[PDB]
Design a protein around this ligand. Structure first.
Ligand SMILES: O=c1ccn([C@@H]2O[C@H](COP(=O)(O)OP(=O)(O)O)[C@@H](O)[C@H]2O)c(=O)[nH]1
Ligand SMILES: O=c1ccn([C@@H]2O[C@H](COP(=O)(O)OP(=O)(O)O)[C@@H](O)[C@H]2O)c(=O)[nH]1
Ligand SMILES: OC[C@H]1O[C@H](O)[C@H](O)[C@@H](O)[C@@H]1O
Ligand SMILES: OC[C@H]1O[C@H](O)[C@H](O)[C@@H](O)[C@@H]1O
Ligand SMILES: [Mn+2]
Ligand SMILES: [Mn+2]
Lengths: 262, 253
């Protein structure tokens, strides 16, 4: 109501375009909750103003960077040290409960029923499903938890160099303790860009509630032709096996977001 | 006890090599349960006899085929429910390898399995705990006939029949240590580096099986002529080939 929020993060203007599409999609599906975006100083002044037209609030935060090149190299994503910035989401005690969503997500149906869930509720990671994917999660802001998380990050770091490792470590009961903290995979459908063959998608994909463009290739990295509605397909590319979501992203961007960027 | 078993399946002499390595590895790690392999008539008479040496029972069954096109025969797994001489069994694909004792799987209840990478609200059917039952068997055969499988193999059928696995009982979700595939290691290497030493079962899931790699015992190394998109973990291939060379190959050659 005033008490609960969807929260996302952008540290630059590229992911900000993702944030804008996510925000638009939440509004399209008539959330009754607040929309908030955490932004760092690399987000341009002009992009912050655009974010303000979609989000109820833009909250400026400091970048938190693991600096963990060794574990980010294992992850194959040397840029993701800045995802520790996500931890600031726990500082938002103006809200009693929030859903964090990655800026590379897209909402396909109303998902306000997530606010029935308890901290920490998340869906399984598509590659290592004993860990939860940290791109969509239900949590409770808390100065206590925020401080504990910052401390763990500074003392031990993260096994993957980013937020997902440290969050899985801190919330390590997730895989075995309480099945009500497992979100269905359709609330974080995160395998499409990185798995070539997904037979389950063909029978269950139509029920997707949130699609998550997990992996190095983001929808905004494509060249989209709005005349024919084609994307230049980038060589071998699992997005093109099931391109409906990438197409949708660009539809929302071109129709609902591009006019705000004028 | 004698009323519980590990059960595997081979429909041909190639997968029989996997079954032999798996059974050898279960002996290596001192299982106290029986070892059973389901075999079809396409397994040669000589290989069936070799299997009878490693396994406690070699049970002949008919191929069930849904109609990787070779995978239609994986419906043959459904025969595992016919083994009512056992109260509880762990089914393991012929392309798995045990690294440590896993007899504690018999504390689990039907249907216990690990989440499948790529769509983890379905379980991977390469390792599962089940209870033999003629009723269940008949029901699975019925489903296979009337609806078929959404993936053309056993996994679709089994996930359809046991459709509340993802949401009902978390004790039926097996951790990765009982079914670790190289797809997972490739997808999230950081997790493998911190947790991976705990693995008790390796699953060589995908088109290129260990017996499709060539192994040079002189250089202690492996390579495959066909590209392996699952990036099979080389250390695991070496463990497989070490067991095969010393324990299995002398029975065949
Ligand atoms: O340079 C970056 C990288 C990441 N992010 C934020 O951190 C999230 C996690 O990164 P990403 O989605 O790239 O990780 P993946 O889901 O691919 O593992 C993003 O969605 C953004 O919200 C960001 O703001 N700037
Ligand atoms: O031609 C075949 C194909 C498969 N199988 C059996 O069915 C299982 C499942 O197939 P596979 O492990 O190849 O599937 P994957 O795990 O790679 O998806 C195998 O391990 C074998 O036990 C068999 O006996 N003959
Ligand atoms: O740990 C860094 C990143 O990897 C994870 O797999 C998640 O998809 C993403 O939300 C997280 O920020
Ligand atoms: O259903 C087809 C096959 O592939 C599955 O993903 C499982 O790993 C395997 O045991 C099954 O037989
Ligand atoms: Mn993401
Ligand atoms: Mn297999």
């Amino acid at each position: 109501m005033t008490d609960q929020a969807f929260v996302t993060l952008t540290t630059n203007d590229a992911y900000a375009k993702g944030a804008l599409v996510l925000g638009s999609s939440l509004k399209q599906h008539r959330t009754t909750r607040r929309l908030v975006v955490l932004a760092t100083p690399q987000v341009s002044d002009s992009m912050r103003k655009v974010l303000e037209t979609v989000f109820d609030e833009v909250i400026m935060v400091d970048v938190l960077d693991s600096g963990d090149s060794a574990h980010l190299t294992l992850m194959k994503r040397p840029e993701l040290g800045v995802t520790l910035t996500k931890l600031h989401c726990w500082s938002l005690t103006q809200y009693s409960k929030c859903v964090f969503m990655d800026a590379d997500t897209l909402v396909l149906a109303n998902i306000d029923d997530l606010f029935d869930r308890e901290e920490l509720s998340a869906a399984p990671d598509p590659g290592w499903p004993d860990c939860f994917n940290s791109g969509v999660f239900v949590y409770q802001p808390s100065v206590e938890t925020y401080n504990q998380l910052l401390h763990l990050a500074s003392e031990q770091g993260s096994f993957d160099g980013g937020d997902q490792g440290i969050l899985n470590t801190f919330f390590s009961s997730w895989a075995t303790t309480d099945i009500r903290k497992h979100l269905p995979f359709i609330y974080n459908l995160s395998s499409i860009s990185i798995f070539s063959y997904l037979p389950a998608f063909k029978v269950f994909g139509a029920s997707a509630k949130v699609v998550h463009f997990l992996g190095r290739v983001k929808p905004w990295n494509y060249t989209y032709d709005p005349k024919t509605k084609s994307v230049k397909s980038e060589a071998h590319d699992p997005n093109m096996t099931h391109p409906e979501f990438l197409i949708l992203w660009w539809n929302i961007f071109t129709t609902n977001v591009l006019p705000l960027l004028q």
